[PDB]
Amino acid sequence: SEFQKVVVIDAKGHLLGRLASVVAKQLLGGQKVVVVRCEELNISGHFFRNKLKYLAYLRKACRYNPSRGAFHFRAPSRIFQKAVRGMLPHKTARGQAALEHLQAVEGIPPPFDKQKRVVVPAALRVLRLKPGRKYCTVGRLSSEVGWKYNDIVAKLEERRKVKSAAFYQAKLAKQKKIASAKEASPVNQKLSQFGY
Amino acid sequence: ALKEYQVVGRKVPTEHEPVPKLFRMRLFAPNESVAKSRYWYFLKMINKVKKATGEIVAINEISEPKPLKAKVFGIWIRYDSRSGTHNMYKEFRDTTRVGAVEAMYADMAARHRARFRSIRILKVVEVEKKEDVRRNYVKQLLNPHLKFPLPHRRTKKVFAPHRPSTF
Amino acid sequence: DIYKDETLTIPKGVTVDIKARNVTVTGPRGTLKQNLRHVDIEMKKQGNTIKFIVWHGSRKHNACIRSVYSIINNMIIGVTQGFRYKMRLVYAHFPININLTENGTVVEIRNFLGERITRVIKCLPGVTVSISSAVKDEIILEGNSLENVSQSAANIKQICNVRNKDIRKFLDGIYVSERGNIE
Amino acid sequence: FKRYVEVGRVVLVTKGEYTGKLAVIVDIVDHKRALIDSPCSEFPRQVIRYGSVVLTHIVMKLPRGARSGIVAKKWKAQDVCNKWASSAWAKKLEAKKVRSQLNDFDRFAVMRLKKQRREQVNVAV
Amino acid sequence: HGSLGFLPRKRASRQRGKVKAFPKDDASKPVHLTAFLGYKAGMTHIVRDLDRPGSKMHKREILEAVTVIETPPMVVVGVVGYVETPRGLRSLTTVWAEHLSEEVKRRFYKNWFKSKKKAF
Amino acid sequence: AQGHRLYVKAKHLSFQRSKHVIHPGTSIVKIEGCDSKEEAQFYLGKRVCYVYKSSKAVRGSKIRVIWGTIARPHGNSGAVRARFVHNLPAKTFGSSLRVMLYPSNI
RNA sequence: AUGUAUAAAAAUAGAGGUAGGCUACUCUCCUGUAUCGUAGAAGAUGGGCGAUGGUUGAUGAAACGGAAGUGUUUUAUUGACUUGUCCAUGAAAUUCCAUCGAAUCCAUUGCAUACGACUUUA
RNA sequence: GCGAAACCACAGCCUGGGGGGCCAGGCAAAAUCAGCGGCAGUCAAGCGCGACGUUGCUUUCCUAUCAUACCGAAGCAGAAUUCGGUAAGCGUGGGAACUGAUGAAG
RNA sequence: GCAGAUCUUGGUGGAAGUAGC
RNA sequence: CUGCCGAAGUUUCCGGAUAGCAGAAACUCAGAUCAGUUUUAUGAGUAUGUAAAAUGAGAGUUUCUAGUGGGCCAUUUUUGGUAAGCAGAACUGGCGAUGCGGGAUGAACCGAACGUGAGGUUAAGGUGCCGGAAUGUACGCUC
């Protein structure tokens, strides 16, 4: 029920082909989608499942000026950006104008650390997948194919959490003051009969 | 849905045969126009009274007398295979004979991919004793100390604010 | 079925904890931590026992139920009784050199069939190996984690592994004979 | 802590015509169906499935397959109603049912309510 | 044309040799340098003893073909600082020193003698 | 600006179409908060618009408007099927409309 | 675009908080149909009762924030806005919706070279 | 400096599928220049035949490795040798616009 | 009564300031 | 330029015929005069043909006059066949003259035969995105 001018979709625990279809419609709907922690997306099937499904895609290049062949991008962000590129009519004028509304990045840059991060309840792994199934993590997968920036982001994201954790306790200590002040306002308890 | 129909019938009486015999069937049919079509199917293969000879006398529904009581049904099936040879005995645990044969069809549609006309049900008896139930899993939903957590949980409106509890 | 339960009585070990999806099995000899991600199985504590349950599943997951029951029991044997194994060496003409370093972690092995190849056998984390003094050409390795202990000696068995010769005539080598608890 | 499916387990119909009524399970017939009843006579006895119901933590002692009056007899003695209402789960869901009968002027009177409530930020500085 | 690692055959961009990789170091090591700059004087030759055991000329006298490189003392004038990003290696701050010679102030300019020489 | 907005935010979705034949005389509109073809019977008949901003200014301002109404529900997800006095331009896919609450019957 | 309101984290065969010295007990989750603010001749001009509070502007700032610090916090000081509550005058015939510095040519150079360019100097 | 002519449906990227155009894809920036085993018989699984059995004679690409790497097996003490496996990367059994050099522009 | 006949006559293009003297 | 009617594409003899299909007038009969049809009855060795019931619909005669005896397939018998296809005879339709929705684009597949438009409702086929429509409901399957 959201028509935000910009939405931020934290992607840990989602599926790739189901989030890329939810997002692909909201791009054509006119929104402005940012997908952070794209590195911690999931794919049904075990670790080698998409691994040969993408090592096969590396064997596919043009046979004329092989610097003009397919550009097999290795970043976890562009893995999913590829997924939202065939879902859109990217050969029209409405496709290539929709794609510039999507900003798919890994980790969380500070311009989106301090904002709300909604999730999609129709693409999540703990819902859509049977318990005890085989699943592979994209950012853990694409590192084994060439994305050489794994040890930095896992270090960087660890620093952001403890800083955000420090942000949370100050926020948690904030409403504990208003928890007292909410019932301390006596009007709440005798005029809760309007449902509130 | 399904609705079990009591069907009886005979042939046209002649001077040679003043009183034809009456034949009762308890079969299952989503409506009544397929009951009185399946009825002439079974009776043609067994009693050899063709559709150009016989007539239909009475169709009635059999509502289950105790739909609120749990039961177990042993199900005798003659299945017409691609070699056309299968007698089958299968047990289902539910409340209504209408509801069992729907589940009977569904399972039979999965493991053995049976169609409508590929199945001729033979006999349906409400099996009652606990020592005659010959299935392991049906037996285990019948011990007094049964228990399980909920399976297949999932508790529009896309873009949920927080994580689902899923507990 | 709808249930598959197997419970092993928890001994006097310090911890039979399974909190936070990890096997933090601590006993009298020490503390051991292990990941509990073998399979999504119900580890339920009941007083002086820990019950392993696999409710409403098939055999593919049910076959792994007894593995964790053994793995915890294997961890229980290491936490309570420990593990102590003795490996026996065989020398005929050229004795095989063996030097325990880093508290017996770095095993400097040489002179295997008189070879000049320096065989360094790094022990697994948590296991201490030593040359047994009662019987010559015997190496006694003990530790809490039997899996790390057993794989290390097998690696030691794979360290001086004979190759490029007939196994019949050339028969002296590194072998494992004693495999038992530390208590 | 984990809740289960028992005999006599109190449940809550979440998807149906009786959505939100406290009902109690009676007999388990399968892994997907069951036998369910409630003392509220507007709720007939019937077979709810587990995909359109949510468990409740409150459990109650009852033998197998009691008739409806005995369900009511055991319900009145072990007072499941107003034991459910004691929980914070019931507080929100019941208040969800009051905050949806609110007309325009009453939903305007709550504006006054929280305007009488907002200036109570005078706290221990 | 068989060494495809050096294909394609197009001319270089920078007349000066650009260093691409840098050696892996540790914080336990003392601070030291890696690179330098020199000039191609020319090729020459020498004679030198060989203290190399196991060779066919062990403890002998062998000619060696060599190259002298003209290397002046080298002027450091400031630092640049890199932060590590998921997008690579960005430079955060460029801090120079106070004073520069005209020679390095000729580097920023195309016509130093014509212009106002007002760099830095 | 919270003492305003007597309409409901919407988004023009697409023309009426089949796979290959599109019917630009009737639009598809997705109202906010309308998530059932039985909950779309409330917005049947309301007078929707499409407000935008041209460059050249006529009659002392710049904002122009295309009116229209809502005719049918459309599908099982709470979209509707609208009809405008001038057909909406095809370069307004995924734009924003306003579903004015009149003619109100509630 | 008509509010341009909302930043723990992890897990789901689980999670966070509650005494106490690392625990036991208790509580919370199981949707945000929540929280947050919202009246004023486009938010009028006055008076009273309650309060040291809320609100935003001009700053002087200080602490911070580097993965794109596109920002956060503490604010002295100054000021408006103070509906916090209660009373006084105005609105309308829009009288049935329309909204100076560099660089290049020419010159110079040879490390470069088919023309271009590149490299020097000026 | 003078200065044609042939020719001219409109044309100009590749892969796959029914060619330049169709469908689905890869992509896509101006403006230019120089190279370019069978037969007979006995059985008998089983549904008159009947299986395994038994008796009579007669440039580049591709692994399917030719060596190099690594192992397995063998009367393999060692050397040397045979068989088998991974293995076509490089060597020593088969298939068949492209690269340069300028160039404006957020 | 013209779109067409390697259509008739006339006029003018791209190839190109290329081929070339 | 527009409108109306509109085929055969196989014979039967000898390129000429006759018939057929499409047509124009004259002149018949409102009847049992018919009918790419189904009944009942007679026979005939479930099928075969014959006559008078159902069902629909107005039928008929000649005269004078164009085009047309190509084929591509799909249907089932079918004998000759065999490593393996297949070769041939007969029946029925389409297409030839036909656009339109699907079948990703395709003439032989599934629906459907067309004046100009508005509004509704469907066939085939579909409802995660490209793509208009359920990330619907139910039960069982699969690594």
Tell me the DSSP string of E38-56.
Answer: -EEEEEEEEEEE---TTST
> How many CB atoms neighbour CB A115 within 10 A?
13
Rounded CA separation E36/E23 (Å): 14
Examine chains B and E and say if they touch (3+ CB pairs below 8 A): no
Nearest to C16 by CA among C5, C6, C29, C27: C27
Nearest CA in chain F to B158: F35
Q: What is the four-CA torsion angle of A26, A28, A34, A40, rounded to 10 degrees?
A: 70
CA distances for D60 relative to B14, D81, E30, angstroms: 68, 12, 74
Beta-sheet strand order (sheet of C5-9): C5-9, C49-53, C42-46
Rounded CA separation C98/C88 (Å): 12
Q: Looking at the structure, tell me whether residues C54 and C35 fall in a common domain.
A: yes
Rounded CA separation C128/C140 (Å): 9
* Partner residue opposite B161 with nearest CB, options A118, A124, A127: A118
Measured from the CB, is F36 under 7 Å from any atom of strand J?
no
| B146/C2 CB distance under 8 A | yes
Q: What resolution, expressed in A, was reported for this entry?
A: 3.7
Exposed/middle/buried for residue D51 (C-beta within 10 Å: 0-12, 13-18, 19+): middle
Computed from CA positions of residues B158, B163, B164, C3, in that sequence, does the dihedral angle turn out positive or negative? positive
Rounded CA separation C103/C100 (Å): 7
Give residue A151's region: left, alpha or beta (phi > 0; psi -120 to 50): alpha
Measured from the CB, is A85 under 7 Å from any atom of strand H?
yes
Last residue within a domain, chosen from C82, C114, C146: C82
Nearest to B80 by CA among B106, B113, B50, B49: B113
Rounded CA separation F28/F10 (Å): 11
Rounded CA separation C85/C141 (Å): 5
Q: Looking at the structure, tell me whether residues C49 and C116 fall in a common domain.
A: no
Helix (H, G, I), strand (E, B) or coil at A8: strand
Last residue within a domain, chosen from C49, C82, C115: C82
Rounded CA separation D71/D65 (Å): 9
Q: Looking at the structure, tell me whether residues C130 and C171 fall in a common domain.
A: yes
Last residue within a domain, chosen from C82, C111, C144: C82
Exposed/middle/buried for residue C152 (C-beta within 10 Å: 0-12, 13-18, 19+): buried
Residues pairing with B73 in the sheet: B92, B126
B162 near F CB under 8 A: no
Rounded CA separation D90/D2 (Å): 19
By the 8 A CB rule, do B94 and B73 touch? yes
Residue with CA nearest C1' of nucleotide G68: A109
C56 near B CB under 8 A: yes
CA distances for D12 relative to D18, D32, D57, E7, angstroms: 9, 16, 10, 72
> DSSP class of residue B143?
S
User: Taking chain E, what is the end-to-end CA distance rounded to the nearest angstrom?
Assistant: 48
Please name the residues in contact with C59: beta carbons below 8 A apart, sequence gap of 6 or more: none
F76 near B CB under 8 A: no
Rounded CA separation D18/D43 (Å): 7
Residue E61 host element (H or E): strand E61-70
> How many CB atoms neighbour CB C41 within 10 A?
22
Nearest to B68 by CA among E60, A114, D66: D66
| A195/D98 CB distance under 8 A | yes
Range of the domain at C7: 1-82
Nearest to B69 by CA among D29, D51, D6: D29
Nearest to D23 by CA among D50, D1, B157: D50
Q: What's the one-letter identity of residue F1?
A: A
On the CB side of E58, CA atoms within 13 Å amount to 5
Rounded CA separation E105/E111 (Å): 11
Residue A154 host element (H or E): helix A150-184
User: Taking chain D, what is the end-to-end CA distance rounded to the nearest angstrom?
Assistant: 41
∠ Cα B2 B7 B13 (to 5°): 155
Tell me the DSSP string of chain D.
Answer: ----B-SSEEEEE-SSTTTT-EEEEEEE-SSS-EEEE-SSTTS--B---GGGEEEEEEE----TT--HHHHHHHHHHTT-TTTSTTSHHHHHHHHHHHTTS--HHHHHHHHHHHHHHHGGG----
Number of H helices, E strands in chain E: 1, 4
Q: Looking at the structure, tell me whether residues C22 and C99 fall in a common domain.
A: no
Rounded CA separation A113/A109 (Å): 6
Q: Looking at the structure, tell me whether residues C47 and C105 fall in a common domain.
A: no
A127 near B CB under 8 A: yes
Phi then psi for E63, rounded to 5 degrees? Answer: -65, 145
Measured from the CB, is F17 under 7 Å from any atom of strand J?
yes
Helix (H, G, I), strand (E, B) or coil at C160: coil
Rounded CA separation C85/E74 (Å): 63
Rounded CA separation E49/E32 (Å): 31
> How many CB atoms neighbour CB B3 within 10 A?
14
> How many domains does chain C contain in total?
2
Alpha helices in chain C (DSSP H): 59-62, 65-80, 146-159
| C39/A132 CB distance under 8 A | yes
Rounded CA separation C142/C77 (Å): 13
CA distances for A97 relative to A31, A36, F30, F50, angstroms: 12, 21, 21, 21
Computed from CA positions of residues C37, C39, C42, C45, in that sequence, does the dihedral angle turn out positive or negative? negative
Rounded CA separation F74/A63 (Å): 49
Long-range (24+ apart) CB contacts under 8 A made by C106-112 are C107/C156, C109/C159, C109/C160, C112/C160, C112/C173, C112/C174
Rounded CA separation F51/F93 (Å): 14
> DSSP class of residue C112?
G
Return the axis-axis angle of helices C65-80 and C146-159, rounded to nearest 10°.
Answer: 90
Rounded CA separation B117/B105 (Å): 11
Residues pairing with F81 in the sheet: F28, F72
Q: Looking at the structure, tell me whether residues C160 and C135 fall in a common domain.
A: yes
By the 8 A CB rule, do F15 and F90 touch? yes
> How many CB atoms neighbour CB E85 within 10 A?
14
Rounded CA separation E24/B80 (Å): 75
CA distances for B93 relative to B28, C67, D48, E93, F21, angstroms: 18, 34, 16, 75, 52
Tell me the DSSP string of F16-73.
Answer: EE-SS-EEEEEEEEEETT--STTTTSSSTT-EEE-EEEEEEEETTEEEEE--EEEEEE
By the 8 A CB rule, do B122 and B113 touch? no
| A121/B160 CB distance under 8 A | yes
Residue listed under structure tokens 């009475």: B58
Rounded CA separation B26/B5 (Å): 6
By the 8 A CB rule, do E112 and E119 touch? no
> DSSP class of residue E17?
P
> DSSP class of residue A6?
S
Phi then psi for A6, rounded to 5 degrees? Answer: -150, 135
Residue A128 host element (H or E): helix A125-128
Work out whether strand F51-58 and strand B23-29 pair parallel, antiparallel, or are unpaired.
Answer: unpaired
Rounded CA separation F84/F70 (Å): 9
Helix (H, G, I), strand (E, B) or coil at C18: coil
* Domain boundaries defined on chain F: 1-106
Residues pairing with B107 in the sheet: none
Rounded CA separation C127/C23 (Å): 19
